[PDB]
Amino acid sequence: PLSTILALDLNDNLKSLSNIKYMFKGAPKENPFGTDKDVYIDTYNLLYWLYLGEDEELAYPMNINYFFTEGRFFTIFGKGHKYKVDVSKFIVGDILFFGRSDTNIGIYVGDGEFISMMGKFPKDETPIGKYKLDDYWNEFNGRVMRFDEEVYI
Amino acid sequence: GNKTLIEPRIQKAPNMLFKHQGVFYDDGTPDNHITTLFISERGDIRASVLNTETQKRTTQEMSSDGSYRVIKQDDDLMLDEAQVWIEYGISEDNKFYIKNDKHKFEFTDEGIYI
Amino acid sequence: GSYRVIKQDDDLMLDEAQVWIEYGISEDNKFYIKNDKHKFEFTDEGIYI
């Protein structure tokens, strides 16, 4: 699939992407992958740039309102329930939400992990990195989505 | 609840204000101090203290363009047509200044002028 | 109608402050910056220290 291949490519290149830096609402106009210079990007913009590399375009800045009405996603699990046993059924490339008000999102990777940027709020200098799901499982909020390209337009 | 945004009915920006006044107090003298925290639709902010009977006012004004300005008046409540007054702040152009009825003290981005 | 900003380093109360700096508009029409040392004042006419 497209989303699984993109997640695998991001995982393979995760250690070379240290130029990318964390910010609250970093919306730079320069593509991070097409420039050796450091750049502050958040998770939403990161996903946008990652999907823009191929033929899909989506829209910018791709805020939380994107998932409501654009019809690019179909929900897998709803918000408000949180089961630890049904995490194994997930698949790579599923988007993982975080926070009580959709503050941050993530991309799921196998072996019970996820890819996201975590750091102090006021523009942290920590680069992108992968963390275990055990400590962040409290703030998962049970919302899960998935991509679909064949039928759209 | 059904994945829909709660649109506001009115999209025009509001204008707020916190007007404060009274009538009297335990000292027995009539109350005549008026103060406001007016906010305009264009983003301006104006904190002012007024004594209407004595015809005195001191305002701290912020413009939409971003101009810090504090004005004090001695004989006119309205900002327009003031004789005795003092001002100091940041004009719409990048110039720090203190001005009054006499010639002002200005601090341009380069040098010192009077 | 007196603009005044005060900063203190060793006393929360405004009264009986040793180390402090002030600047603003006094009850009389005089722009000034004053501290423990002699002040910088800008009267309606002229410049004084």
Q: In three state form, how does the secondary structure of A38-104 look?
A: CEECCHHHHHHHHHHCCCCCCCCCCCCCHHHHCCCEEEEECCCCCCCHHHCCCCCCCEEEECCCCCE
| Extended beta strands in A1-153, E state | 20-21, 39-40, 73-77, 95-98, 104-109, 113-116, 129-132, 144-147
Buried b (16+ CB within 10 A) or exposed e, A17-46: eeebbbbeebeeeeebeeeeeebbbbbbbb
Interstrand relation of B105-108 and C4-8 (parallel, antiparallel or unpaired): unpaired
Resolution (A): 4.5
Method underlying the structure:
cryo-EM
**Residue A69 Cα, gap to closest chain B Cα (Å):** 8
Please tell me which residue of chain B has the smallest CA distance to A67.
B3
Distance CA B29, CA A152 (A): 76
3-state secondary structure of A6: helix
Name the residue among A89, A96, A93, A106 with its Cα closest to residue A148: A93
Residue from B72, B97, B107, B113 whose CB has the most chain C CBs within 10 Å, to mutate: B72
DSSP B31: P
**Residue A136 burial (CB count, 10 A):** 16
| Percentages (nearest 5) of helix, strand, coil residues in chain A | 25, 20, 55
**Residue B74 Cα, gap to closest chain C Cα (Å):** 9
DSSP A8: H
- How far is Cα of residue B33 from the mean position of the Cα atoms in its chain? 16
- B86 close contact with C: CB closer than 8 A: yes
Contacts of B23 (CB under 8 A, 6+ apart): B30, B31
Amino acid residing at A127: P
Distance CA B78, CA B100 (A): 16
Distance CA B39, CA B18 (A): 9
Distance CA A33, CA A53 (A): 9
**In contact, A20 and A43? CB cutoff 8 Å:** no
Distance CA B89, CA B68 (A): 5
Distance CA B77, CA B2 (A): 53
DSSP A70: S
Cis peptide before B8 (omega within 30 of 0): no
**Residue C1 Cα, gap to closest chain B Cα (Å):** 5
| Extended beta strands in chain B, E state | 33-39, 45-51, 56-62, 68-73, 85-90, 95-99, 105-108
Between helices A43-52 and A2-13, what is the axis angle to 10°? Answer: 110
Cβ-defined contacts of C6-11 (< 8 Å, 24+): none
Residue A55, token pair as written in the block: 């033929």
- Inspect the structure and tell me whether chains C and B have 3 or more CB pairs less than 8 Å apart: yes
